[PDB]
RNA sequence: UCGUCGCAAUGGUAAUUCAACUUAGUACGGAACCGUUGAUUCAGAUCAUUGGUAGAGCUAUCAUCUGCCGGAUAACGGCUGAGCCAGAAUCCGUGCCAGAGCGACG
RNA sequence: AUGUGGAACGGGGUAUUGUAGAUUAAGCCUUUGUUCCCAAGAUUU
């Protein structure tokens, strides 16, 4: 149940686990920003 | 369709349409287990398997408890192969009987004068030569030997005191070997735990759980994963590798509508058709499956003994 | 070395090459073959988070393995890890130490947002100063920096003297 | 072998049984039972909840 | 006559597809056999856990489990020179579901 | 259809809600507890 927020663990398939990370939705930064990428493994 | 049309099984026991393919090379044994669908528990099974996605993942899934332990093995029944089908050549049980078996053979045991196999027991005991002659004829004529086996309905905790007789054919063994095994198991209590450990995929069968205005239909759970034998008499029924501590398979304070099985259960990881205390028909697979997943055993790490009725999390 | 590994290169992320360790199946075996013999390639799984250069950084001695590793996984890693291989449980902000801390004996530079406790954990236990720094803007240094004693870090397992890269690691 | 302790009920939450109030930050406020699960969802203080162990501790 | 345990004439029938990894960056820019891990649809079950319903019960492709191998073949390719072999998600069986005629036993 | 006889309760356990209490198996368990009654008649072979 990807509900703990922040697809599979980390993967979003265009979810953090289970967890749903954040969703860009209509255009909101939350999902789109993804902590501004970079950082861990998105560098 | 396959299961269609829907029809509830009139017989409480899940009469098996087929049985595992007997072979005289294999030792004379059985291929059935008289379960009773006690209950269920989240027996967390650590699936230690490299390559698998759920590697060492504790599978907290329903271990469908089915009371199955020492079942009265009365005798054997001959079965000769005929051009018109399989015909029962003879049916020679043991001299010793049981009240539960007699209650099963009748409908008003207490009202009845307990005449069930009255002279038959005397004939079996006194005229042992006639029993031996019939047994010799069975060994020389019958193609298959259906080892008669009742249940422990009166022995184990249950309102029904009618022993569920089952014509469990001797799975494997020669004619002499099957007769010798039947003679050894004459008037004995065939234990389902002794027959199988219920630690892998099984071929459990039996009627479903009667819902109401359906269910109770004879089914056969193919590749029914069995977690472990839920020995209700032993305090360690739900005790596992990580849980341990003599955990009881029944929920804390008794399972819902089934309490604590007086004897061993057949707790199976997954589903099992049948309600609480509804007699199951666990059996061996007719065919053979050498799949790696079936061969690889999931290590039962933890289990669930929570007082589900109520505080569904209070294990103690 | 651009070690061929499935589809994603991610050799460093999967295997956080430490100073005297490599924190590592063919690619892990390849890391165990070359790097593992000298720098022990401990096959880190971290309870399914097999990526070491994403969670488990640190120079060999007290390598800052993520505390997110399960109790069995952490104990198995710690028991297998010797004194010069010890897997220090990174429980601070660098819980993604492998990506966060830029594992390297000289300096195990931690993520810019990594806590000082995680910074000191690699600094003291791993004998490799985890300076909290964002490698080329990316907060988690170990992912961006293929740190060595002498996302590049995610895509290249940089041991004390080695820099083994991934399948299709950008040249 | 330690299991998550109930935030609502102050007693080790059973595996799967009970509930953990996992918010967006994955607070995972564990609960000893279904009653504590409602308390966990409301983030009820274990000291406040008499059934919870922390109330006895307090 | 009652009751128990069985036989099986016959009727129905069920599984389906895809992805990834290993093969293999190999054979010859780039496969395929096998194997492995999972998902889609469908079917049959169950309520240990979770959600819903006002603890229980019910229930959720909102939860979990399970879902095969033999023969004979078509196209087609071979053997001797018709008679055989190989050969399909096809067909008939194994298995599963129902049990009209019957068996053994008290 | 004269004894684990069953049926009932008295319950205990069990939990719920809930702030400990009551329900307390009802498709939660279970009872060294209690009393009641018992082919008792009727009916067909």
UniProtKB/Swiss-Prot annotation, chain A:
Component of the ribosome, a large ribonucleoprotein complex responsible for the synthesis of proteins in the cell. The small ribosomal subunit (SSU) binds messenger RNAs (mRNAs) and translates the encoded message by selecting cognate aminoacyl-transfer RNA (tRNA) molecules. The large subunit (LSU) contains the ribosomal catalytic site termed the peptidyl transferase center (PTC), which catalyzes the formation of peptide bonds, thereby polymerizing the amino acids delivered by tRNAs into a polypeptide chain. Component of the large ribosomal subunit (LSU). Mature yeast ribosomes consist of a small (40S) and a large (60S) subunit. The 40S small subunit contains 1 molecule of ribosomal RNA (18S rRNA) and at least 33 different proteins. The large 60S subunit contains 3 rRNA molecules (25S, 5.8S and 5S rRNA) and at least 46 different proteins. It is found in: Cytoplasm; Nucleus. Belongs to the universal ribosomal protein uL14 family. The chain holds residues 24 to 125 of 139 of the full protein. There are 2 genes for uL14 in S.pombe. This is Large ribosomal subunit protein uL14A.
UniProtKB/Swiss-Prot annotation, chain B:
SUPFAM superfamilies: Translation proteins. GO terms for molecular function: RNA binding; structural constituent of ribosome. InterPro entries: L3_arc_euk, Ribosomal_L3_dom_3_arc_sf, Ribosomal_uL3, Ribosomal_uL3_CS, Transl_B-barrel_sf. Residues 5-18 have a biased composition (Basic residues). It is found in: Cytoplasm. One of its GO terms (biological process) is cytoplasmic translation. PROSITE patterns: RIBOSOMAL_L3. Its main location: cytoplasm. Residues 1-21 are annotated as: Disordered. The modification Phosphoserine is found at residues 52, 127, 130, 194, 239, 299. GO terms for cellular component: cytosol; cytosolic large ribosomal subunit; preribosome. The modification Phosphothreonine is found at residue 316. Keywords: Cytoplasm, Phosphoprotein, Ribonucleoprotein, Ribosomal protein. Component of the large ribosomal subunit (LSU). Mature yeast ribosomes consist of a small (40S) and a large (60S) subunit. The 40S small subunit contains 1 molecule of ribosomal RNA (18S rRNA) and at least 33 different proteins. The large 60S subunit contains 3 rRNA molecules (25S, 5.8S and 5S rRNA) and at least 46 different proteins. uL3 forms together with ES39L one of the contact sites for the signal recognition particle that targets ribosomes to the endoplasmic reticulum membrane. Belongs to the universal ribosomal protein uL3 family. There are 2 genes for uL3 in S.pombe. This is Large ribosomal subunit protein uL3A. It comes from Schizosaccharomyces pombe (strain 972 / ATCC 24843).
UniProtKB/Swiss-Prot annotation, chain C:
InterPro entries: eIF6 (IPR002769). NCBIfam families: eIF-6. GO terms for biological process: assembly of large subunit precursor of preribosome; cytosolic ribosome assembly; maturation of 5.8S rRNA; maturation of LSU-rRNA; ribosomal subunit export from nucleus. Keywords: Cytoplasm, Initiation factor, Nucleus, Phosphoprotein, Protein biosynthesis, Ribosome biogenesis. This is Eukaryotic translation initiation factor 6. GO terms for molecular function: ribosomal large subunit binding; translation initiation factor activity. One of its GO terms (cellular component) is nucleolus. Binds to the 60S ribosomal subunit and prevents its association with the 40S ribosomal subunit to form the 80S initiation complex in the cytoplasm. Is also involved in ribosome biogenesis. Associates with pre-60S subunits in the nucleus and is involved in its nuclear export. Belongs to the eIF-6 family. It comes from Schizosaccharomyces pombe (strain 972 / ATCC 24843). Disulfide bonds: none annotated. It comes from the Eukaryota. The gene is tif6. Pfam families: eIF-6. CDD domains: IF6. It is found in: Cytoplasm; Nucleus, Nucleolus. Gene3D superfamilies: L-arginine/glycine Amidinotransferase, Chain A. Monomer. Associates with the 60S ribosomal subunit.
UniProtKB/Swiss-Prot annotation, chain D:
It is found in: Cytoplasm; Nucleus. It comes from the Eukaryota. Belongs to the eukaryotic ribosomal protein eL24 family. Involved in the biogenesis of the 60S ribosomal subunit. Ensures the docking of nog1 to pre-60S particles. Activates and recruits ATPase afg2 to cytoplasmic pre-60S ribosomal particles. Associated with nucleolar and cytoplasmic pre-60S particles. At the end of biogenesis it dissociates from cytoplasmic pre-60S particles and is likely to be exchanged for its ribosomal homolog, rpl24. This is Ribosome biogenesis protein rlp24. It comes from Schizosaccharomyces pombe (strain 972 / ATCC 24843) (Fission yeast). The chain holds residues 1 to 58 of 192 of the full protein.
């Amino acid at each position: 149940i990807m509900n703990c927020a922040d697809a599979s663990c980390g993967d979003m398939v265009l979810v953090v686990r289970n967890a749903g990370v954040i969703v860009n939705p209509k255009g909101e930064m939350k999902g789109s920003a993804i902590t501004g990428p970079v950082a861990k493994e998105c560098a | 369709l396959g299961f269609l049309p829907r029809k509830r099984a009139s017989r409480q026991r899940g009469k098996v349409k087929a049985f595992p393919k007997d072979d005289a090379s294999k030792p004379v044994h059985l291929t059935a287990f008289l379960g009773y669908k006690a209950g269920m528990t989240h027996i967390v099974r650590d699936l230690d398997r490299p390559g698998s996605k759920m590697h060492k993942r504790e599978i907290l899934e329903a271990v469908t408890v089915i009371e199955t332990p020492p079942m009265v093995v009365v005798g054997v029944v001959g079965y000769v192969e005929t051009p018109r089908g399989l015909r029962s050549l003879t049916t020679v049980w043991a001299e010793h009987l049981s009240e539960e078996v007699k209650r099963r053979f009748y409908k008003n045991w207490f009202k009845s004068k307990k005449k069930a196999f009255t002279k038959y027991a005397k004939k079996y005991a006194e005229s042992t030569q006639s029993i031996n002659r019939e047994l010799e004829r069975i060994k020389k004529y019958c193609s298959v030997v259906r080892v008669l086996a009742h249940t422990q309905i009166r022995k184990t905790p249950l309102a029904q005191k009618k022993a569920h007789l089952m014509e469990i054919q001797v799975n494997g063994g020669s004619v002499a070997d099957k007769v010798e095994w039947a003679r050894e198991h004459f008037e004995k209590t065939v234990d389902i735990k002794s027959t199988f450990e219920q630690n892998e995929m099984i071929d459990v069968i039996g009627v479903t759980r009667g819902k109401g205005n359906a269910g109770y239909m004879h089914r056969t759970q193919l590749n029914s994963k069995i977690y472990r034998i839920g020995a209700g008499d032993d305090a360690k029924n739900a005790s596992t590798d990580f849980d341990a501590t003599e955990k009881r398979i029944t929920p804390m304070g008794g399972f819902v509508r089934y309490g604590v099985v007086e004897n061993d259960f057949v707790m199976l990881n997954g589903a099992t058709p049948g309600p609480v205390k509804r007699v199951l028909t666990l059996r061996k697979s007719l065919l053979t499956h050498t799949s790696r997943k079936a061969l690889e055993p999931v290590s039962l790490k933890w289990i669930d003994t929570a007082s589900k009725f109520g505080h569904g999390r209070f294990q103690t | 070395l651009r070690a061929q590994f499935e589809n994603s290169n991610e050799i460093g992320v999967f295997s956080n090459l430490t100073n005297s360790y490599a924190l590592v199946e063919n690619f892990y075996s390849v890391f165990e073959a070359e790097l593992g013999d000298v720098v022990p390639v401990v096959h880190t799984t971290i309870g399914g988070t097999r990526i070491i250069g994403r969670l488990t950084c640190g120079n060999r001695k007290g390598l800052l393995v993520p505390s997110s590793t399960t109790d069995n996984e952490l104990q198995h890693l710690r028991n297998s890890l010797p004194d010069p291989v010890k897997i220090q449980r990174v429980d601070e902000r660098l819980s993604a130490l492998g990506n966060i801390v830029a594992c390297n004996d000289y300096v195990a530079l931690v993520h810019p947002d990594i806590e000082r406790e995680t910074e000191e954990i690699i600094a003291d236990v791993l004998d490799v100063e985890v300076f909290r720094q964002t490698v080329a803007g990316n907060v988690l240094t170990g992912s961006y920096c293929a740190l060595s004693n002498q996302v590049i870090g995610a895509g290249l397992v940089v041991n004390d003297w080695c820099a083994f890269a991934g399948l299709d690691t950008t040249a | 072998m330690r299991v998550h302790t109930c935030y609502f009920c102050s007693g080790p939450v059973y595996p799967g049984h009970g509930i953990m109030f996992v918010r967006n930050d994955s607070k995972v406020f564990r609960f000893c039972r279904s009653k504590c699960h409602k308390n966990f969802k409301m983030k009820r203080n274990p000291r406040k909840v008499a059934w919870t162990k922390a109330y006895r501790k307090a």
